[PDB]
Paper text:
[name], first identified as a regulator of ribosomal RNA (rRNA) transcription in Mycobacterium tuberculosis (Mtb), is a transcriptional activator widely distributed among bacterial species, including Thermus species, but is absent in Eco. [name] is a global regulator that is an essential protein in Mtb, the causative agent of tuberculosis. Crystal structures of Tth and Mtb [name] reveal an N-terminal domain with a Tudor-like fold ([name]-RID, RNAP interacting domain) in common with the Eco transcription repair coupling factor (TRCF)-RID, and a helical C-terminal domain ([name]-CTD). The structural results, combined with supporting biochemical studies, establish that the [name]-RID makes a protein/protein interaction with the RNAP β1-lobe, thereby positioning the [name]-CTD and a conserved Trp residue to interact with the upstream edge of the transcription bubble, using a wedge mechanism to prevent collapse of the transcription bubble.
Docking [name] onto the RNAP was facilitated by a high-resolution crystal structure of a Tth [name]/Taq β1-lobe complex (2.4 Å-resolution). Unique among known transcription activators, the [name]-RID interacts with the RNAP β subunit β1-lobe, which is near the upstream portion of the transcription bubble in RPo. The relative orientation of the [name] domains ([name]-RID, [name]-CTD) seen in the Thermus [name] and [name]/β1-lobe structures is only slightly altered in the Thermus [name]/RPo complex: the [name]-CTD is rotated ∼11° (with respect to the [name]-RID) to interact with the DNA. By maintaining the [name]-RID/CTD interface seen in all the Tth [name] structures, binding of the [name]-RID to the RNAP β1-lobe positions the [name]-CTD to interact directly with the upstream ds/ss junction of the transcription bubble. A crystal structure of Mtb [name] in complex with an Mtb RNAP β-subunit fragment that includes the β1-lobe shows a relative orientation of the [name]-RID/[name]-CTD domains very different from the one in our Tth [name] structures, despite high sequence and structural similarity within the domains. In the Mtb structure, the [name]-CTD is rotated ∼140° relative to the [name]-RID.
Author numbering:
A (entry chain B): 3 to 160
B (entry chain A): 17 to 139, 332 to 392
Write the structure that this text describes.
């Protein structure tokens, strides 16, 4: 299901790369894990093989899933809660789940507001954090820097 | 010599050259292993575990000279490899995190605290390392009973070793230990 050198995402630390399959005994119970190495980080994650989707692990965007993300940032709209509390809750969730598509579509909506109607700072931080995350996974997917992945986004807006 | 045991007291107290796996349950290692692991939650709810793998000491920003020619300390940052495990899902998250800056001895046998060439003394049979190694145990005590307080405000999927940890309680523990020391 997952193989060494696979580029991956694991909410919340984001992108990483499957090192291999690790055997750890943890609390008296030995089990096999997928090991994930994180970007210039010295931080790792170990995901039980038995069910890794079950626990949030996924592949990152392929280079061809990328132009659809760029379209979401450019033209993405989604309905958002009337009230700020519920809205921040929604956005907080979307950001956590780490669904790149949902995040891009959110970000597209949020940016849109920032233009036409105006974006509350609270929501703005949701946009930044969204950008941040997408820039890293896109940078990973196309093997370009994060600065370069952002600059892409910048153009998608104008 | 008196100063000989002390530059050795401190020496093995640290094992800063020992490969962590070849490091022995002594001093700092002892402090860590006494303190760790930290479990919390009922296993089912936010069943958590924060566990210790090893500590590393990253060499000092400056040699003797510069810590001396400046009102600062001859210090090494200390970091530890920790794993957070959700007892729920079996997921392990391993970070290396920064705990505190850590003062170093000279071959002479002294520290350069805030520039001051201060000195701690061997009391009640305890040596330098020992007396200190127990102060280490103190901060870590304070830090546990932190980490485990955080352990029960939920946020399981969001949580990380990094987020369970800060440098304050250990900073304090050595801040005080070295604010009680001679001046050569």
């Amino acid at each position: 299901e997952f193989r060494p050198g696979d580029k991956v995402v694991l909410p919340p630390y984001g992108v990483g790369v499957v090192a291999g399959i690790a055997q750890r005994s943890v609390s008296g119970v030995s089990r096999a894990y997928y090991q994930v190495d994180f970007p210039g980080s010295r931080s790792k994650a170990y995901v039980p093989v038995e069910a890794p989707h079950s626990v949030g692990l996924r592949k990152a965007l392929a280079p061809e899933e990328v132009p659809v993300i760029l379209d979401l940032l450019k033209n993405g709209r989604m309905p958002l809660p009337k009230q700020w509390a519920a809205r921040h809750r929604k956005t907080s969730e979307i950001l956590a789940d780490g669904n790149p598509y949902r995040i891009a579509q959110m970000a597209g909506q949020l940016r849109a507001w920032e233009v036409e109607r105006g974006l509350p700072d609270l929501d703005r931080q949701a946009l930044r954090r969204a950008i941040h995350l997408l820039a890293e996974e896109v940078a990973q997917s196309l093997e370009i820097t994060v600065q370069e992945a952002k600059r892409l986004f910048e153009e998608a807006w104008g | 010599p008196l100063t000989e045991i002390q530059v050795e007291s401190y020496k093995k107290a640290l094992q800063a050259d020992v490969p962590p796996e070849k490091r022995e349950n002594v001093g700092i290692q002892a402090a860590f292993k006494e303190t760790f692991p930290i479990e919390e939650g009922d296993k089912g709810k936010g069943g958590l575990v924060l566990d210790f793998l090893e500590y590393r000491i990253g060499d000092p920003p400056f040699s003797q000279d510069e810590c001396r020619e400046k009102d600062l300390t001859y210090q090494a940052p200390l970091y530890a490899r920790l794993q957070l495990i959700h007892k729920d899902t079996g997921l392990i998250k391993e970070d290396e995190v920064f705990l505190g800056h850590l003062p170093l001895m000279t071959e002479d046998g002294s520290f350069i605290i805030n520039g001051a060439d201060r000195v701690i003394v061997s009391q009640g049979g305890r040596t330098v390392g020992e007396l200190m190694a127990d102060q280490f145990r103190v901060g870590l005590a304070r830090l546990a009973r932190g980490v485990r307080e955080r352990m029960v405000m939920g946020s399981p999927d969001t949580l990380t070793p990094a987020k369970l940890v800060n440098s304050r309680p250990l900073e304090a523990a050595l801040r005080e230990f070295f604010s009680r020391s001679q001046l050569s």
